Symmetry: C3
Subunit: 224 residues, 3 copies
């Protein structure tokens, strides 16, 4: 509803983000190869930070009251804090893996940058119609990322060790399906056009969350 009905999923989300955190920490202990160590460090802040956000979200600090088209709607801007950080870090996990030219890395981060950032302003507009105007400009941002990811990073990927190629594909396909889920979820949800209730919203991004970060966590890190 606005800080009480989904206290559950939230709690559930904190337990999951942080468990995943304690796990990695107690899994990179060994690590000799500095090369892989990178992946580790990265593939760990993500859950950690993710944990801090899902925690303030539960306790309260998370939400805020954005006024749009009639009544006062809930907006865990706390998410965006997270996504603003995680999402880049993730891309790097990808670029870094498939050794991408800094050129594309850079354009890729900034692409994501404008995406999430704008996703925030979207979920912070008072004028009801404008909310979607950013939704638009933002998606355009994502379709960009996914494009120059599923095209390039595929090629370069599939031009080295069989290890990389395959693994890349794993995450790559997941990332695409997973990620894409958002625009819609956001939409049907209370942050955009309120179709489903917050009882849902929370739980949707909740699953997409633990799966994208810890999914991409076990999946990635547990590969050569």
């Amino acid at each position: 509803i606005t800080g009480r009905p989904e206290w559950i999923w939230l709690a559930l989300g904190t337990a999951l983000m942080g468990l995943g955190t304690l796990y990695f920490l107690v899994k990179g202990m060994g690590v000799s190869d500095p090369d892989a160590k990178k992946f580790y460090a990265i593939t760990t802040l993500v859950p950690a930070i993710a944990f801090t956000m899902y925690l303030s979200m539960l306790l309260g600090y998370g939400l805020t009251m954005v006024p749009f088209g009639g009544e006062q709607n809930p907006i865990y801007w706390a998410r965006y804090a997270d996504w603003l950080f995680t999402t880049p870090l993730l891309l790097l996990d990808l670029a870094l893996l498939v050794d991408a030219d800094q050129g594309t890395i850079l354009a890729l981060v900034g692409a994501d940058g404008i995406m999430i950032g704008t996703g925030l302003v979207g979920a912070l507009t008072k004028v009801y119609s404008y909310r979607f105007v950013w939704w638009a400009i933002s998606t355009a941002a994502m379709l960009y990322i996914l494009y120059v990811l599923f095209f390039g990073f595929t090629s370069k990927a599939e031009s080295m060790r069989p290890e990389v190629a395959s693994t890349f594909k794993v995450l790559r396909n997941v990332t695409v399906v997973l990620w894409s889920a958002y625009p819609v979820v956001w939409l049907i949800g209370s942050e955009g056009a309120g179709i489903v209730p917050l009882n849902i919203e929370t739980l949707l991004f909740m699953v997409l969350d633990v799966s994208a970060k810890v999914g991409f966590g076990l999946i990635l890190l547990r590969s050569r």
Copy 2:
């Protein structure tokens, strides 16, 4: 006045930032040399981001009401968001071009960092007299950048290919004149001591804007 008289220039500014964006995007398509690709990626986020800011500025989100010395004055803090990002990216375009030692790059970004950042606090102070105290400290910041730019980057520049040297000078001279324009513009303007009206302010930074980013865009990117 405060969101209505300059709706024009604003609209005009959005059309220009974004047009420049679509242009680059459809101009880096080819690009084989990863070296130059860097320039591209960079020389593109700038307009893009620039576009997003000038857009929220028009629709509304842009402005805010800062209270100083009597009445309530307008402050498109939205600009600063932009400048906070563009300006560094630009410097990198410069440093990167004239292959500058990370040492100076770093000190240069942070120099700009303190500049824009402080330019914000300046344009956010309630006590009328203090506004200028930051104006001061801030300018000091710029004079720093321009100094260690027009001095160093000139030398190193003029010690390679005739291409670089000349091009550097192009942008370098523009950057200096252009950039400098601000301190004054800001001043005469409503964000500092209100001399000219917002009918102007907007339109001034508007021109200095499209010219600095897209100016530096065509100018730069269209060179070897």
Copy 3:
């Protein structure tokens, strides 16, 4: 009390941060070795930025009124702005010195990132009990940094020139004692459980401040 009793220490803190700034600036003038230049640039933004924060803190902008457990308490969020920037830069001074693998650098910055960041949310919670919940999670963050600093960076350090080893130890030991002081100071202080008055708080972080940045300034920079 809340912007008047400690106007002193504050003023004193500004004078010190900025003096240290003018000093470095007029001490890196020479510098031929690009390698060391890095240290310089870094070891300078720190004081500079530090100066800007301690200045807005004195003039006013600094503080804010956070409501927790009864009455309205003061919170120079301005600090956190500072620490959020300085602290990383410092670590880099360390990592960079003892040539640490980017892997650890990265995990180290993000470690600090979550630390300060969370230290803020801590000092921004309304519910009195939660304030300490972040205090906890945050410290955990620091103990992390100090751990993987006093362990690793020691080893790698002590495996090169006698210069480095010794110097590292200097700063390293200082950093540890100094840094640690905070959690407690914060605690006994008004930002956490209000034991001592703001007459103190200010002056404590004031000393720990000028000593950590300018301490680590002269100490570091004045070594081979």
